[PDB]
Each structure stands twice: as structure tokens, then as C-alpha cells.
């Protein structure tokens with residue numbers, strides 16, 4: 001039912017002549033209605049008690065400081081109620097500045113808890129917005145094909161991870177979804193990196209940088225990840241102190257029992273400062289944060305390959321196609337909208353050549369949900385049509401004729417999100433855009449070895465040329 | 478030191494059958510026999526364990542056992558249990574250990590220790606232990622623990638010169654980090670002691686890395702691997718780091734669940750306040766599973782853990798350069814010479830003692846060429862406290878004269894004529910520690926040794942740029958050839 005939004009405030013801050021002010025304040029001072037007469041109205045009333053109410057227009061905490069002006073010839077809060085319309089009931093949720101939440105036979109009734117400082121800082125605004133966004137939501141990722149290569153014959157049908165484990169290419173690491181790469185598998189990773197460097201990054205004029213791998217909340221606040229990335233983060237906590245005396249109990253406990261006291265260690269570490277590299281590109285942005293670029297400096301074309309990314313993926317035993325610790329080449333570009341779109345197309349042309357002529361794999365491209373929207377809790381598609389992600393996918397023969405194709409890398413136009421988030425300006429003042437491309441080496445390896453096999457004699461001439469003589473593994477009895 | 482005897486004193490009783498009375502005399506005979514034959518086994522002349530008194534009861538064959546260094550009372554009582562069960566439930570009354578010590582120790586919370594008091598000659602420990610603990614060899618580990626804390630309470634870091642280069646002219650005296658910041662080579666990252674390297678600084682790192690590959694790793698036949706960067710408690714237990722690495726690790730905690738409903742409260746908090754609720758997040762993460770890469774080599778050893786290597790497969794010569802190392806160093810605002818996040822090439826080798834010694838020699842020879850001929854820096858090397866001991870909280874040297882660490886140090890002219898030199902890399906011989914810790918064997922049954930070498934790229938840069946400056950025109954020809962044409966940085970208004 002069409003219930004109405006209602007702001008309700010009880011507040012208090014010798015004179016009888018205030019009858020020519022308060023009576024007319026309900027028709028002159030607070031009458032600023034948008035569609036019609038939608039201002040603050042009917043209610044009852046230096047303890048000057050106010051019970052005045054409002055809707056979306058001329059808010060009760062925007063009108064309460066307007067009465068601070070008129071009466072000038074601190075505000076203490078008593079009761080605050082927000083009646084929010086909702087077509088159906090909603091689950092109980094704890095949200096700061098909310099004391100009570102109740103679903104009824106009408107909608108949702110919130111009981112907020114604010115001071116005058118909280119009213120000034122716009123607290124009821126964000127609570128409303130969030131609650132309205134939860135009721136608006138009260139489905140699925142987007143996908144459509146752009147191009148696919150003609151089907152190929154697939155003489156190799158085995159799981160490449162199984163094939164790699166059997167043949168001593170790699171082994172499982174100690175941590176969840178983690179691998180140790182022996183000489184052969186390492187040779188494959190470095191050859192993919194050499195290809196991306198020589199066939200893409202150098203001819204396109206990209207410059208190497210080293211991005212930080214420990215990412216703080218500050219970065220993820222600016223990148224928007226602080227909006228919903230939490231389920232997949234590997235959190236990092238420093239110790240509360242470096243004082244050995246403080247850690248002696250833990251060390252002594254271990255030395256006697258041969259078990260590390262993980263519960264006591266958790267008390268002795270600080271709250272998390274952030275987490276391990278997740279999307280890779282965000283910590284780069286502190287390099288350009290608050291800066292203004294001269295127009296001759298763009299497009300800024302940069303890449304990183306200096307470490308591991310960590311994601312707490314879904315449970316189960318997987319191959320190197322799905323891991324909790326991975327190795328990516330992050331490619332980032334910044335410029336005008338036109339340059340960002342042009343840079344993206346330059347990359348597509350270089351990726352096409354690589355996958356067709358060097359790896360000679362069967363692959364496709366598809367428009368999907370923007371990486372940044374997915375990683376902060378959202379789905380669907382971006383508002384601007386030029387903004388979004390293009391996914392690169394390839395078949396894994398072992399998965400069967402109907403198996404799902406593996407996303408092995410992406411290319412994204414991010415719009416002005418990052419330049420806005422990190423406050424990066426252009427000298428001319430024209431809007432800055434950015435893009436990025438993530439190359440997953442474990443994913444390239446899953447695709448290549450699933451299609452081509454582990455035998456150099458069956459790999460394309462172009463790849464084999466770039467590999468050199470394959471190294472030997474470490475053999476055991 | 479104290480000459481006082483290490484002694485063990487156990488008051489206990491058995492129950493290896495259904496309850497009798499005093500109904501067997503062979504008990505008296507086997508205790509006298511054990512003192513003369515059984516409890517002497519594994520002990521030098523007259524240093525065996527002794528049952529010094531015994532009495533019977535209702536299913537209680539109570540005895541007072543005594544011993545020293547060998548055939549310890551927690552080991553000897555199971556020798557007696559096997560006897561008193563095959564010839565015909567251990568409960569402990571008291572477990573006393575007297576340990577020689579010069580100085581008195583501040584008592585601390587240690588499991589299975591009821592009492593600790595000073596005596597003449599050393600320290601007396603009354604243990605709170607049962608039969609499971611004795612079988613587990615808990616008394617042994619308590620003794621090792623106390624011996625470590627007694628050894629530490631005596632009269633820091635060791636240092637002795639091995640080779641030094643003839644002093645060079647030092648025309649550049651700027652702090653290379655300040656110089657690099659002013660010229661747009663790098664900027665500080667958001668995290669404590671963290672840096673973002675622009676095109677110019679990254680070019681330098683990559684050139685060092687190429688020098689190590691081409692001048693060392695390739696001609697010496699090293700094979701690249703990729704070691705894990707998130708390190709688990711399992712790895713650090715086997716490496717010994719679990720013994721005291723704690724004050725300096727960046728701890729890693731996974732979420733307790735991926736369930737988005739569990740994390741809704743966190744996201745909602747941020748959306749309303751614009752603040753990340755770090756206190757609530759700490760409640761929602763799991764206990765730490767380990768921490769970020771610290772020594773780099775330990776997680777490799779999971780590759781060889783519990784395996785046997787064929788003799789034709791050694792020496793095993795591998796390296797890793799696949800990511801970042803993280804250490805919670807001492808506070809203060811510093812340059813790239815003192816960082817919490819660094820990039821190292823970890824070089825590892827495994828084989829026999831003589832092969833490991835040889836591989837160490839080969840690396841030293843290649844390093845000497847690099848620093849003398851290519852970087853052309855003023856440097857030295859010195860024998861120092863073994864890296865693995867220092868990261869366990871220990872000082873001094875290993876008692877095997879060949880086991881230890883050689884540090885490479887170089888002067889930073891901005892620190893002045895008397896400033897401390899900077900350690901920029903090391904080469905270590907680690908003995909059997911890692912093969913033993915991870916259970917790696919050799920087919921021939923001969924001992925397996927390993928070593929490692931850590932090349933810290935930030936440290937190479939701090940040293941090279943402090944001595945040579947940031948201008949390529951003043952760099953050595955051999956270095957300038959390898960760098961190629963330096964790239965432009967990103968210019969700001």
C-alpha cells in the first residue's frame with residue numbers, strides 16, 4: 001500500500017509575542033514544497049519543546065536549524081521516528097544510529113538515535129537511502145557474446161592440474177587453494193609474462209611500476225570496495241606490539257605443547273588494517289591521489305606484476321583454475337574518455353593476435369557485469385554503455401561438450417570512478433577516465449594446458465619457440 | 478657456569494593388572510635387576526636411572542624413581558611398565574627437575590609447570606604432568622625451554638669481518654629516498670613502511686633482478702620456482718619460526734564465512750558512517766591461519782616435505798621472485814632502507830654437506846663479481862648470527878662451525894663517515910635443520926643439508942643510489958648498458 005514517509009522529532013533548546021512567528025512558520029518559513037504544499041506542518045508543542053514533523057521535503061533536522069535562526073531574536077534530541085513504506089516485511093538488521101526496527105502491516109518503522117552533531121552531519125539521510133535500497137532490492141550476473149572463434153579439435157581431454165600433479169609440474173601448498181610451482185609450471189608462467197610484455201605491453205608503450213600488495217582501508221574506501229568486498233578478503237592484522245615480553249606466552253606455549261595457540265594470538269593482534277591484494281589496481285591509485293596531471297602526460301599507461309592476489313573463494317577441491325592465491329599482471333590506463341576507449345581497443349587487438357597466433361587457442365569475448373560492481377555487492381550492468389567489463393573465455397575440453405568456459409582475463413572501462421574516488425584531476429579540467437586489464441596466469445595455464453597438453457611436441461611452434469628447452473622437475477622416490 | 482647436576486625426580490605408581498594385595502615377590506627382584514641392567518641402557522657408566530624406593534598397595538605398585546641426563550624418569554618409567562606387565566595406568570605424585578643456572582629467572586606462565594624456585598646451583602621445577610604428557614615427552618621440551626632462558630640470561634649480536642673493499646670516493650651524499658621522492662621515482666604507499674615505485678624506480682629493481690638471473694642464477698644452473706606467499710602455522714612449525722617469529726609478522730585471518738548475510742552488518746555500518754568498523758570485523762574474521770611471507774624460503778619446503786630425493790637429483794638449486802615479504806619492523810618514518818613491505822629474490826639449494834658448502838662458495842664468487850665489476854660499489858661481508866636463530870629470538874652462533882650466515886654490508890655516504898653500513902643481502906648454510914624439520918631424506922641415507930640466500934631489492938637500490946646518485950651519466954658503464962634507456966616518470970602539476 002502507498003504509505004507515506006514520515007519524519008518525527010521531539011526536541012528542546014518569558015515571551016508571548018512568539019505567536020506571530022510559530023503560527024506563520026508553518027505556512028511561510030517551512031512551506032518549500034516541490035510538487036505541491038509539501039512542507040512541514042500539523043503537530044503539537046530554555047526548554048522549548050518541539051514535536052514538528054515532515055516528509056522527504058524540508059526534513060525535520062533541516063527545519064530544526066531553521067528555527068535556530070528565527071528564535072535567535074545546542075539542540076537536545078528526545079524522540080526520533082521514521083516510518084518507511086515497504087510493500088512487504090524485511091529481516092531484522094543492526095545499523096548504526098538505529099535503536100529500533102519493526103516490520104508491520106504497513107511497512108517498516110525505524111527509531112533513529114541522533115544528537116545535533118549527528119543531525120548536522122546528515123545521518124538520517126544515509127540511513128534512509130540504505131534502508132530504501134534494501135527495500136528496492138526486496139538477481140543474476142549479466143552475460144552476452146561479442147565474438148567466438150570457430151570450433152577446434154581437442155585431442156587433449158585430461159584435467160591439466162591432474163596432469164601437472166602426476167608429472168611433477170606442481171604441488172599443493174599448505175594454505176587453502178594454494179599451489180607451489182615446480183620448475184616446469186614456473187617456466188609456463190614466465191613465458192606467458194614474456195608474451196604479455198613483448199607482444200602487448202612494450203609495443204603499446206606501457207611502463208612498469210610496482211604497486212603495494214598490502215591494501216589498507218583508506219584505499220578500499222576510495223575505490224568503493226569498502227562497500228561490500230568483505231566476504232572474500234584475507235584480512236591482515238599487525239601485532240599489537242613488537243615487545244618480545246608480550247609474545248613470550250605464545251612462544252612458550254608452542255615450545256611445550258607443539259601447538260600454536262591461535263585463540264590467544266587472535267587476542268594479541270590488532271584489529272585488521274585492511275587485507276591482502278584483491279583487485280591489485282586500487283593501491284596504485286595512491287600514487288596519483290590528489291594530483292593534477294598535465295595534459296601532455298596522458299594517457300598514463302602502466303602495469304604491475306610484483307606479487308600475489310588473495311581471495312577467499314568458495315569451498316571445494318579445485319585445480320589451478322580456481323585458487324585462493326594467484327598471480328596476475330594488472331594493466332592500468334588513465335586519460336580522457338576517448339583515450340581510455342582507444343587504449344582498450346589497442347589491447348583487444350594485441351590479445352587477439354596472442355590467442356590466435358601464439359597460443360592458438362579456442363576462445364571468446366563477452367560483455368559481463370563490471371568487475372567493480374560485482375566486487376562491492378552489485379550486479380547487472382553499468383549506467384553508461386561505454387563503461388563495463390569484457391571477459392575472455394576459453395573451453396576446457398575435460399569439462400565435456402557442455403562444460404562451462406573459463407574466464408581467463410578481462411578488459412574494463414571504469415569511467416570516472418577511480419579518478420573521482422582518489423581525486424585525480426586533469427590540468428585542462430576535462431573529465432579523467434580509467435581502464436584496467438587483469439591477466440590471470442593460473443587461468444592462462446589452465447586454458448593452454450587443457451587445450452594443448454603438457455607435451456612440448458604438441459604445442460604451437462610460436463609458443464614452443466618462446467619457451468626454450470623445458471626444465472626438468474624435482475623427482476622423488 | 479654452574480657445575481650442578483641435571484637431575485630428574487619422579488614419585489609415581491603403576492596399575493598393570495587387576496587389583497592384588499602384597500602377593501608377589503618378583504617385584505623386589507626386578508627393581509634391583511633394572512638398576513643394574515635395564516635402567517643403565519643408553520647411559521654412560523654409573524649414569525643410569527635408579528628406583529630408589531618402592532612400596533605396594535591396593536592396585537598401587539608405587540615407586541620413587543631418580544635419574545639424570547640419560548634414561549630420564551619419564552622415559553624409564555615406561556621401561557619399567559613393559560617389565561611389570563610382561564613378567565607378571567601410571568599416576569604421577571610429583572615430578573621434580575633440578576636445572577643448573579647462574580642467575581635467577583623471572584617466572585612466567587608456562588603450561589605444565591606448577592612451581593619454580595631457586596636452589597643452590599640452579600632452578601627447581603615442579604611439574605604438573607600425567608602419563609600422557611610423559612609419553613609426549615613434555616618434560617624434555619620444558620627442559621629445552623628453560624635451558625634456552627638460562628643461556629639467554631648470560632652475557633649482543635655477533636660480527637666478524639671476512640672481506641672488505643678498498644674505500645671509494647663518495648661524491649653523492651643525498652639520502653637516496655629523499656632524492657627519489659623529489660625527482661618523482663616513487664611515493665609512499667598507504668600502509669606502514671610501504672612504497673609505490675614509479676617507472677624509474679621499478680626500472681632499477683628490474684635491472685638488479687636481470688643481473689641476478691644472468692650473472693648468477695643462469696650460469697650456476699638455478700631453476701625458477703614459485704613459492705607460496707601466504708604462510709601457514711604448519712610451515713612455521715616445521716621451520717622453527719613458530720618458536721618466536723611472532724613480534725614481527727603481519728598476521729592473516731580469513732573470513733569465518735563467505736555468506737554475504739554475515740557481512741551485511743559491516744557493509745551497512747560503512748554505508749551509514751563512512752567508517753570501516755574494524756572492531757566488528759575483528760569479531761567476524763577467523764583466528765589467524767599464519768601470516769604474510771617473512772623469510773620466503775619456508776613455504777617452498779612443503780614441496781619436498783616427507784619425500785626422499787634420489788642422489789642424481791641433488792644438489793637441488795631453485796629460486797623464487799614471485800612476490801612480497803612483510804615484516805612489522807620498528808616504528809618511525811623511514812626511507813626504502815627500512816620497510817615493512819619488500820621484494821626479495823630467495824635462492825635455495827639442497828644436497829650433501831659438501832655440495833651445500835660448494836654452492837655457497839659459487840654464489841659468493843658470483844656476488845663478488847657483481848658488486849665489484851657491475852655495480853662497482855663499496856661493500857664488505859661478515860660472519861654474523863645465523864638468520865634462522867635471530868628470527869626465533871636467539872643470538873650467538875651455531876656450534877657446527879660451518880653452519881651460519883654471511884651478511885653483505887655497504888656504506889651509505891649520506892649517513893656520514895661514521896654511519897652504520899647497510900645489510901643488503903646474505904648467504905647462509907643452514908645445516909640439517911630444514912631437511913629434519915620438514916622430513917626430507919636422501920636415498921643414500923647420508924645427511925641432507927641446505928642453504929639459502931636472500932637478495933633484498935630495496936636494499937640493493939638504497940646502497941647503489943646512495944653511492945652513485947640518480948643520474949645515469951654517473952653510473953658505471955656495465956650497469957648503464959643493462960638498464961638501457963631510463964623511462965620517464967609521471968609528472969604532476
Ligand SMILES: Nc1ncnc2c1ncn2[C@@H]1O[C@H](COS(=O)(=O)NC(=O)[C@@H](N)CO)[C@@H](O)[C@H]1O
Pocket residue numbers: 278279280281311313320321322323324325326328330371407408409410436437438439440441442443
Ligand atoms: N580466484 C582466482 N583464481 C585465479 N585467477 C583469478 C581469480 N580471481 C580472478 N582471477 C583472474 O584475474 C582476472 C581479473 O580479475 S577480476 O576480478 O575479474 N577483475 C579485477 O580484479 C580487475 N581489477 C582487473 O584485475 C580474471 O579474469 C582472472 O583471470
Ligand SMILES: Nc1ncnc2c1ncn2[C@@H]1O[C@H](COS(=O)(=O)NC(=O)[C@@H](N)CO)[C@@H](O)[C@H]1O
Pocket residue numbers: 771772773774804806814815816817818819820821823864900901902903929930931932933934935936
Ligand atoms: N624489513 C626489510 N626491508 C627490506 N629488506 C629486507 C627486510 N628484512 C630483510 N630484508 C632483506 O632480506 C635479506 C635476507 O633476510 S634475512 O632476515 O636476513 N634472512 C632470511 O629471511 C633468509 N630466509 C634469507 O632470505 C636481507 O639481507 C635484506 O636484504
Ligand SMILES: [Cl-]
Pocket residue numbers: 215276277278279280281282283
Ligand atoms: Cl586490492
Ligand SMILES: [Cl-]
Pocket residue numbers: 708769770771772773774775776
Ligand atoms: Cl616465511
Ligand SMILES: [Zn+2]
Pocket residue numbers: 279280281282330436437438
Ligand atoms: Zn583493475
Ligand SMILES: [Zn+2]
Pocket residue numbers: 772773774775823929930931
Ligand atoms: Zn631463506
